[PDB]
């Protein structure tokens, strides 16, 4: 590493080299945090986490008990040991608390003054973070499994919602229009994710073992349907062209948005060319998941090699996205891990699981 510092000082290597190499080294040295703790307030398992995209300071967490906790991740104390204190809380005494489990919570991109939370109580609530009051509510005829706002859209502000209905809802936060729907799936839509690269590209994964990419501006259904075999087993499109041999319960675009990682209940993760949905045949081995709802997993950013952190039983499996090589198992949870969210500023990880714990993984040394 002194070689890295010397090369940076002497201009031999771009500082990009040291930055991404050290980010990768930090991610590889991920371990149970020696001096850090997260305050425990959820009475039930944490189903979702979200660190705000700008300044990466505050973290939302939705629990199976319906409460939403807002934590400050910064060590505002002077000690090396600190607990991520809870700033705010939609608790059981809040007038607008979710009646059932909160399954997805997401900070509004471009601004930390608002966030959103969808629950199995058939509601997508939009909260003002300052007053901590519901600015809006969208009701659905069937329970919400996931939702996502575009991390890129300066123009549109649509929330793509996947419920147990076979339709992907698009709720306009600009003047409230939840009527827009996308047809083409056949069972519950367990995951939805906007492309970080393209403004109007949305990937939706449903229990019909299919993943569809939509240009929501378009009037002609999905753009691409992901196919495991790319055409080896080709059939007229009524039941073929499946992404997995089970329910596809998780989506994640890579950092650049040029590839898509789909995890399904066939104990398989697959990497897809996001421009034509071709399977890249990256192996990843066996990725154990049996979740009946959406599975939240994230990818690394700002590193020499991209990593993907997938909940794997009661562990976090870290894989290399483009080679599939298994990095490691982060092993500190006592029950199945529901979500993991990656802090890209310091290569940190926060994992929420059914054991009512949010565990922080920090690079060692």
């Amino acid at each position: 590493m002194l070689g890295f510092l010397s090369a940076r000082q002497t201009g031999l290597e771009d500082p990009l080299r040291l930055r991404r190499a050290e980010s990768t080294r930090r991610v590889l040295g991920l371990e149970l945090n020696k001096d850090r703790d997260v305050e425990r307030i959820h009475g039930g398992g944490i189903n979702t986490l979200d660190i705000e995209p700008v300044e990466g300071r505050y973290m939302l967490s939705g629990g199976s008990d319906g409460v939403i906790v807002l934590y400050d991740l910064e060590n505002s104390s002077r000690q090396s040991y600190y607990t991520c204190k809870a700033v705010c809380s939609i608790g059981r005494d809040h007038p607008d608390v979710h009646r059932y489990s909160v399954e997805t919570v997401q900070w509004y991109p471009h601004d930390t003054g608002m966030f959103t939370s969808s629950s199995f109580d058939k509601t997508l609530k939009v909260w003002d973070t300052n007053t901590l009051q519901t600015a809006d509510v969208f009701n659905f005829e069937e329970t919400v499994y996931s939702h996502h706002m575009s991390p890129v859209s300066t123009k549109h502000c649509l929330v793509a919602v996947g419920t147990r209905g076979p339709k992907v809802q698009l709720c306009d936060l600009k003047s409230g229009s939840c009527s827009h729907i996308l047809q083409g799936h056949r069972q519950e839509i367990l995951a939805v994710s906007w492309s970080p690269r393209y403004d109007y590209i949305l990937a939706t994964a449903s229990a019909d073992s299919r993943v569809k990419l939509w240009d929501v501006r378009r009037a002609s259904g999905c753009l691409i349907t992901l196919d495991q075999h790319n055409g080896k087993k080709s059939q007229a499109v009524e039941s073929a062209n499946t992404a997995h041999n089970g329910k596809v319960n998780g989506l994640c675009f890579t950092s650049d948005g040029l590839h898509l990682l789909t995890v399904g209940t066939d104990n398989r993760m697959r990497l897809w060319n996001s421009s034509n949905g071709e399977n890249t045949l990256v192996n990843y081995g066996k990725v154990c998941n049996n979740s009946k709802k959406g599975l939240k997993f994230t990818v690394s950013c700002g590193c020499s090699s991209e990593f993907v952190f997938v909940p794997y039983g009661s562990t976090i499996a870290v894989y290399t996205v483009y080679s599939g090589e298994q990095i490691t198992m982060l092993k500190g949870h006592y029950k199945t891990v529901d979500c993991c969210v990656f802090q890209s500023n310091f290569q940190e990880l926060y994992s929420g699981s059914r054991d009512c714990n949010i565990l922080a993984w920090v690079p060692s040394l």
Binding site: P109, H110, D111, M114, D136, K174, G176
Partner: protein, 268 residues
């Protein structure tokens, strides 16, 4: 209105004459609303269509009981036909061209007979005319001004044709759909209309026709509520119930504008 100044269209008027049932027409209407068929309709036993269509026919002209100069469809037995006779006389003496619409083909035939009874040179186009001759006919009426009146059914005479040669337009019979009447009246006020146009929409006062006018005003208000503005005034002229069988002859956003808009919408 946003294009009229930038298009140099002539002036428009949209008068609505409330015609008066004649003694014989009023008698037939009163006898029908006092008949047993309408009584059964109001009890839900029969469909409403028979009574509705019968009243519309009576207001158009008493062709139910076809009563020399007493042939079928004689103009003096219908008030709207009397008004049309007066209007046609006035407009002909003013050297203008008229566009005479009707919802009913039978009433169009009656108007055609009344026009041959006068010396007016007419030209007819309804659903029975061969399609191949329709655009020719229109061109004829647009070309030579010797033709005075253009008879039309609103379903064929309306709906996209260009009849700018016509100067006056008279909608003889209201329809349940407002849009039929709107397109019929815009057949004349179009790009290429070099003369001031007026629309005369005939309704019989205190009859089913006025109730239909009310229903389609309500429909137009409902349409304007979502097409031009949502501050539309409530329809208060009537409750629009099933008592139209009565004769009542007169005499990136930074989460603050977005949050503010959410609050605005929710407080409503």
């Amino acid at each position: 209105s946003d294009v009229k100044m930038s298009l140099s269209l002539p002036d428009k008027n949209e008068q609505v004459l409330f015609c008066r049932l004649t003694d014989e027409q009023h008698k037939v209407y009163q006898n029908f609303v006092d008949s047993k068929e309408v009584y059964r309709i109001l009890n839900g036993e029969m469909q409403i269509f028979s009574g509705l269509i019968a009243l519309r026919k009576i207001c158009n002209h008493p062709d139910l009981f076809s009563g020399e100069e007493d042939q079928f469809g004689y103009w003096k037995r219908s008030g709207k036909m009397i008004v049309v006779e007066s209007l046609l006389k006035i407009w002909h003496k003013q050297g203008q061209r008229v566009l005479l619409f009707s919802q009913s083909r039978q009433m169009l035939d009656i108007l055609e007979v009344f026009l041959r009874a006068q010396k007016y040179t007419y030209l007819k186009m309804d659903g029975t005319t061969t399609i191949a001759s329709r655009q020719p006919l229109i061109t004829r009426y647009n070309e030579d001004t010797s033709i005075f009146v253009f008879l039309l059914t609103t379903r064929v005479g309306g709906l996209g044709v260009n009849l700018t040669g016509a100067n006056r337009v008279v909608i003889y019979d209201p329809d349940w759909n407002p849009s039929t009447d709107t397109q019929a009246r815009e057949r004349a006020w179009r790009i290429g209309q070099k003369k001031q146009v007026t629309v005369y929409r005939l309704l019989t006062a205190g009859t089913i026709e006025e109730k239909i006018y009310h229903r389609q005003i309500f429909k137009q208000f409902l349409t304007n509520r979502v097409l031009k503005d949502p501050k539309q005034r409530r329809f208060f002229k009537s409750n629009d119930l099933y008592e139209l069988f009565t004769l009542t002859s007169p005499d990136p956003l930074a989460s603050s504008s977005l949050l503010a808009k959410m609050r605005a919408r929710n407080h409503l």
